[PDB]
Design an enzyme around this catalytic site. Structure first.
Site, mmCIF file in Angstrom:
data_model
loop_
_atom_site.group_PDB
_atom_site.id
_atom_site.type_symbol
_atom_site.label_atom_id
_atom_site.label_comp_id
_atom_site.label_asym_id
_atom_site.label_seq_id
_atom_site.Cartn_x
_atom_site.Cartn_y
_atom_site.Cartn_z
ATOM 1 N NE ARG A 89 -2.955 -2.358 3.092
ATOM 2 C CZ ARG A 89 -2.802 -3.812 3.563
ATOM 3 N NH1 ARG A 89 -1.629 -4.279 3.504
ATOM 4 N NH2 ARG A 89 -3.820 -4.317 3.769
ATOM 5 C CG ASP A 96 -5.071 -4.522 9.758
ATOM 6 O OD1 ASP A 96 -5.671 -3.444 9.498
ATOM 7 O OD2 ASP A 96 -4.280 -4.848 9.066
ATOM 8 N NE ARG A 117 -8.685 -8.550 6.391
ATOM 9 C CZ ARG A 117 -8.697 -7.449 5.234
ATOM 10 N NH1 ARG A 117 -7.425 -6.378 5.541
ATOM 11 N NH2 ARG A 117 -8.991 -7.644 4.277
ATOM 12 C CG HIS A 133 -4.709 -0.883 7.137
ATOM 13 N ND1 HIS A 133 -5.319 -2.014 7.136
ATOM 14 C CD2 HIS A 133 -4.816 -0.595 5.688
ATOM 15 C CE1 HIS A 133 -5.868 -2.490 5.991
ATOM 16 N NE2 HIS A 133 -5.569 -1.665 5.549
HETATM 17 N N1 NAD Z 1 -8.015 1.091 4.535
HETATM 18 C C1 NAD Z 1 -8.597 -0.280 4.079
HETATM 19 O O1 NAD Z 1 -8.355 -0.917 4.935
HETATM 20 C C2 NAD Z 1 -8.777 -0.253 2.730
HETATM 21 C C3 NAD Z 1 -9.463 -1.359 2.373
HETATM 22 C C4 NAD Z 1 -9.772 -1.708 1.003
HETATM 23 C C5 NAD Z 1 -9.377 -0.813 -0.091
HETATM 24 N N2 NAD Z 1 -8.560 0.310 0.398
HETATM 25 C C6 NAD Z 1 -8.388 1.623 -0.443
HETATM 26 O O2 NAD Z 1 -9.631 2.104 -0.859
HETATM 27 C C7 NAD Z 1 -9.316 3.010 -2.278
HETATM 28 C C8 NAD Z 1 -10.540 2.606 -3.262
HETATM 29 O O3 NAD Z 1 -10.376 1.268 -3.333
HETATM 30 P P1 NAD Z 1 -11.278 0.931 -4.693
HETATM 31 O O4 NAD Z 1 -11.430 -0.633 -4.871
HETATM 32 O O5 NAD Z 1 -12.747 1.259 -4.419
HETATM 33 O O6 NAD Z 1 -10.855 1.686 -5.890
HETATM 34 P P2 NAD Z 1 -11.756 1.657 -7.354
HETATM 35 O O7 NAD Z 1 -11.023 1.848 -8.514
HETATM 36 O O8 NAD Z 1 -12.892 0.563 -7.303
HETATM 37 O O9 NAD Z 1 -12.715 2.923 -6.954
HETATM 38 C C9 NAD Z 1 -11.863 4.306 -6.773
HETATM 39 C C10 NAD Z 1 -12.544 5.405 -7.423
HETATM 40 O O10 NAD Z 1 -11.872 6.582 -6.907
HETATM 41 C C11 NAD Z 1 -12.586 7.610 -7.763
HETATM 42 N N3 NAD Z 1 -11.483 8.694 -7.976
HETATM 43 C C12 NAD Z 1 -10.346 8.677 -8.303
HETATM 44 N N4 NAD Z 1 -9.897 9.909 -8.126
HETATM 45 C C13 NAD Z 1 -10.707 10.716 -7.634
HETATM 46 C C14 NAD Z 1 -11.030 12.072 -7.379
HETATM 47 N N5 NAD Z 1 -10.048 12.997 -7.462
HETATM 48 N N6 NAD Z 1 -12.177 12.353 -7.177
HETATM 49 C C15 NAD Z 1 -13.066 11.612 -7.165
HETATM 50 N N7 NAD Z 1 -12.961 10.254 -7.166
HETATM 51 C C16 NAD Z 1 -11.821 9.884 -7.658
HETATM 52 C C17 NAD Z 1 -12.685 6.541 -9.010
HETATM 53 O O11 NAD Z 1 -12.870 7.418 -10.217
HETATM 54 C C18 NAD Z 1 -12.951 5.376 -8.760
HETATM 55 O O12 NAD Z 1 -14.300 5.387 -8.777
HETATM 56 C C19 NAD Z 1 -7.898 2.474 -2.528
HETATM 57 O O13 NAD Z 1 -6.960 3.263 -2.163
HETATM 58 C C20 NAD Z 1 -7.832 1.172 -1.811
HETATM 59 O O14 NAD Z 1 -6.567 0.675 -1.555
HETATM 60 C C21 NAD Z 1 -8.444 0.905 1.714
#
Ligand code: NAD
Ligand code: NAD
Ligand code: NAD
Ligand code: NAD
Lengths: 331, 331, 331, 331
Positions: C105, C165, C168, C192
């Site tokens: 990440r 986490d 999990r 994380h």
């Molecule tokens: N913290 C956690 O535990 C955890 C868990 C899972 C996923 N995530 C993180 O979630 C984030 C999103 O994951 P995902 O599967 O949904 O991605 P995804 O690609 O499905 O969707 C990401 C979205 O962000 C939107 N986007 C990008 N730049 C933008 C901006 N400037 N303004 C508005 N929207 C914008 C996109 O257009 C897209 O729809 C990633 O960074 C991923 O690593 C974190």
């Protein structure tokens, strides 16, 4: 070196102010049935309980708190002074004298109007912008009373009205038809009383008017005696009183229902008491049940039900009976 | 042709058999609290209500039924008879005498055993496989009685126990520490009464042991009086009884939590009353609360909590206290 | 006269102002999981959806809106604009790049900071008082970035962190011990990601410390390999990414749990990302998960967990790991 | 000397057998949207996931398990072999080819009928007494297909049918009228398609027939173009597909809805696909949406809607179109 201090490192402090506060005035059968139902439905983040009975009040407060683990309403408070009520989104009024076996709900007027002249000014002082929900009987007269003393706009003063009556109706039709009540549609309009109007012309299952299939249905003489369903609705309150002494669970559940449409602003249609001057050719200041779209601002609109001339006959009937009483008040 | 035959075309009859049927025995303050809480949690598809007071019974049933529109338990039934209780997954027994003001729960033993001698064989006969959840006081002793009369394996005879005392403990700890009861961990073991044990060796917030931070915590005569929290737990029932006459909301919530672990087969750990012969040097057939893992089959396991010598001492005196009353075998 | 004017009699206009408004920024796999979970928990009265992909956005909005009958969030809106996000109590930021298979990440940092530089000032401007809930990876670093850009007090800038986490961890422990995750206690602190810390000093079932029963537990090379449970926690994201390409259900659930503590002001303790300068000998401005007490104002307190020398060592190396990437200040 | 053994004292063992098991066949957009919705509504104690995609299947299983803490469904299982499905109360079929932009849902027939000839015999082998709920498109043809292969009684084979269509309808009317969809009643009958029949004669708000107030409403030429609401209902699926690529949340929510009436046996009325031979003067073996009372045994009764001759005109129209296709099958 307090335990708390070794364990917790403080960042912020005690803001207070709640976003979704609900007050319940009166902690009796109905008041606690309202409180339990509203807590289980998770509508408030703060509930305030008010009664003049100090012991009972503190005792019910404690029993609800003891159950904190199992709830999602972290502040439960109570008192005799209305300061506890401050900045309530909704105030449920349940306080007053209840019916004795065979008592006409219209006999409670003297006793309950004295209670209201007392509590209304105290609740409006602390929550100038609340939605008043009156449950106390006779609910139609008492909603008018709250309106009149409070000085509030007709939208923020609601009477529980015929929500319960129509809930009993659906239940009774549902048992005849073998369909869940949720699925049988039927309105009990007017007075939350003995002069309530069943609107037969609107009773349906999945868009089909039972009156087109059975024109004999309703206000007459011949049949499968559908007319006795309206009669058990008028009688149900009395029979429950005769059997357990009072009614509580069905009203508590019907209050949580309205409370959800107000708190979440869903704009749902519910038969509740509202000011009907200028609507069924009723020229006075009466409060009676009509279908109203209920939201965060209270009653925002009324639905102009298409009534048959017989049904409009009983609505000016219910409405006159009711105003007869009301001029004798005027305070 | 009925209006029914015109509206609806039937495709089947069939044996309406319940899958998640709950029986509540005794329709008093505790029984209806249990009932409403179980109905709002939507655990049952059919609830049966049994009481000896025919009128009260019909009454509570109809009140509940009129609220049908607001619930998701389509069938609500009652009878004095027990044929109504057939094929129940769980039965909640709340029948009997309760404490008068200042009365020990141990004092009701003789009157409640007299009632269990009649009810248990009528339950056991119609739901051969139900889980019995004993609420009636003194809960520990009636759970043993229920066990004994029934002929049921121990796993299927559960006392409500210290589930409630643990909730009250967590609430009080909660207040002081400024955290919700849900994030304060702590157990009240032993008798659901005056002899209950606070397990201070185990009280924690996020894995950190308060006894580790403040070694003087509790069963210590020193400085911030955490010991007074246990005294409040012990005293809490007596105190709500003096103010409102009986307790009901907390136990109805606590029972619906228990009911949830059992119906959904959750395998959560709850401090409940079970047979502790063999554990903690207990040589007698006494029932008391110990952390148990609860599921569709009742108690499948007991957690061996590691008790300080002073907490083991106190648990022993608690089973010593219950056995003293237990040699009375009037059944 | 419209059909509308004939059916309905209007009593008011008014300013439809939201009381429990939630904004979800980024309508991807993680944003919609968050959204659906928050809608089914009925936390919001209005949800606003913002994304840069105009079509996807409209699409998800309409899909959600067609399900209106089944939800209790009457208003669902979206826009590319941010005027739509006004007076939000909470905003959940899930916008940005996610991991490709085998990707750390920490590798997304540069791309996501580029997006936060635009989104944060548009959020901060229209909801001056919202709580920011940061989901985008690497969550710890974006939470610091979000903080820094925003100008908001630390209490109101929350990273989703080790909530997930920890879930999990509890799940895996659960499996082995035969108890639901809800009765297994244990915390995953720090980053994380790969450097997260299992706090074995605190893992318990009903107050009993597993490290007390089995002193070789975890950060011990000895016999039943509890240490392999932490390795599974670390690896779990990588492993679901290899099998379905991304993770979504668990984090949407974890976010709606967080969201619940904040909206209802629960004061529950959650392992979330916050500024730990001053605590645990941490001299740098790094964000990482530590047990926090969560409410209507965001993080009001941090729990001082008592770490074994080896767990403190590992937490330090975890903030050492994050600061290494943190000196990049490209904003 | 295992940790488990020092901690847990076993009483009972691993019964298995679930009371409320639900299976979801196909773990794609729709299948996981069904699963999430059904888990949040807490209808099952055991959910079974089946797909031919092994990686995807295990990956979605893990993401749902990871979220265990937050759920109340303790057994989540999956597999490629149907043995996992054993003794399911309900089987939701979502598997198959979905529409490409501009694709006629009737084009999927070859591809989806090959899938069904394969899975039906495998699901009926393990759950001889389940309620089949078919979601896969074209849902009307495919429900007939399941019926035909399975050999089940017409009550245990349901097609999701026009539940979603009528949900879109209410939503669209609700926005015109300014009333929550819950409160606007309107049936979309026939084919879950392009030839769906709006039943105008049954559309009402609080018992009032919009057609008596506005006779121009419906299947014509003049107005406030109410007829375009039916048209957006027919078009909504296509537009969502064009915008995000597929539809999922509204179907998932509408499946949880039916799933609740089956699991809880509420006997609610829902527009779903059932066998209509001998009802609107339709003499063939067609499956199309009609209002049906749904319970624990499946479809127990059909509601004979009072249709205008024009509406009965389009129902034999929708129904013929549909059988045209169906004889070409016969396998
Ligand atoms: N913290 C956690 O535990 C955890 C868990 C899972 C996923 N995530 C993180 O979630 C984030 C999103 O994951 P995902 O599967 O949904 O991605 P995804 O690609 O499905 O969707 C990401 C979205 O962000 C939107 N986007 C990008 N730049 C933008 C901006 N400037 N303004 C508005 N929207 C914008 C996109 O257009 C897209 O729809 C990633 O960074 C991923 O690593 C974190
Ligand atoms: N609208 C409905 O459908 C409906 C249905 C059932 C009952 N009710 C009504 O609800 C009312 C209460 O019935 P109940 O069984 O709970 O009565 P109850 O005897 O159990 O309780 C009434 C409560 O009002 C309190 N009270 C009296 N004066 C007060 C004051 N100034 N402020 C606060 N509280 C005050 C009492 O102390 C008591 O606790 C009755 O008027 C009854 O008719 C309405
Ligand atoms: N375990 C706990 O934590 C706890 C908490 C609260 C109350 N309780 C106990 O709950 C019990 C019930 O309390 P309560 O307030 O509801 O009492 P209550 O008097 O309100 O109701 C008791 C009911 O038992 C019914 N009953 C008596 N004998 C019967 C029999 N043979 N068959 C059927 N029904 C019979 C009565 O008719 C009455 O309706 C008491 O023993 C009380 O001490 C236990
Ligand atoms: N009735 C409705 O209102 C409605 C609404 C939306 C979509 N649908 C339908 O649902 C179906 C699925 O759409 P979707 O987006 O989830 O598709 P999708 O591409 O995302 O998923 C389909 C799933 O079916 C699986 N599959 C194929 N053969 C299989 C077999 N023998 N056993 C198990 N699974 C098998 C795939 O592996 C895939 O995971 C389509 O037919 C679509 O038209 C119906």
């Amino acid at each position: 070196a307090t335990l708390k201090d070794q364990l917790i490192h403080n960042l912020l402090k005690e803001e207070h102010v709640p976003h979704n506060k609900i007050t319940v005035v009166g902690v009796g059968a109905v008041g606690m049935a309202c409180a339990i139902s509203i807590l289980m439905k998770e509508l408030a983040d703060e509930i305030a309980l008010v009664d003049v009975m100090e012991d009972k009040l503190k005792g019910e407060m404690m029993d609800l708190q003891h159950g904190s683990l199992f709830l999602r309403t972290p502040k439960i408070v109570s008192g005799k002074d209305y300061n506890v009520t401050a900045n309530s989104r909704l105030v449920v009024i349940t306080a007053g004298a209840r019916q004795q076996e065979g008592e006409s709900r219209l006999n409670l007027v003297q006793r309950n109007v004295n209670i209201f002249k007392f509590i209304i000014p105290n609740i409006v002082k602390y929550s100038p912008n609340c939605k008043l929900l009156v449950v106390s009987n006779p609910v139609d007269i008492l909603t008018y009373v709250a309106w009149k003393i409070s000085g509030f706009p007709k939208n923020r003063v609601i009477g529980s009205g015929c929500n319960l009556d129509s809930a009993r109706f659906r239940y009774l039709m549902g048992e005849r038809l073998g369909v869940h009540p949720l699925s049988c549609h039927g309105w009990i309009l007017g007075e939350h009383g003995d002069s309530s109007v069943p609107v037969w012309s609107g009773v349906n299952v999945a868009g089909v008017s039972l009156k087109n299939l059975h024109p004999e249905l309703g206000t007459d003489a011949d049949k499968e005696h559908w007319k006795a369903v309206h009669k058990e609705v008028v009688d149900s309150a009395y029979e429950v009183i005769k059997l357990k002494g009072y009614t509580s669970w069905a009203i508590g559940l019907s209050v949580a229902d309205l409370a959800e449409s107000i708190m979440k602003n869903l704009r749902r249609v519910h038969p509740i008491s509202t000011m009907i001057k200028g609507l069924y050719g009723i020229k006075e200041n009466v409060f009676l049940s009509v279908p109203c779209i209920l939201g965060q601002n209270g009653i925002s609109d009324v639905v102009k039900v298409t009534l048959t001339p017989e049904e409009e006959a009983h609505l000016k009937k219910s409405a006159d009976t009711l105003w007869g009483i009301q001029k004798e008040l005027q305070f």
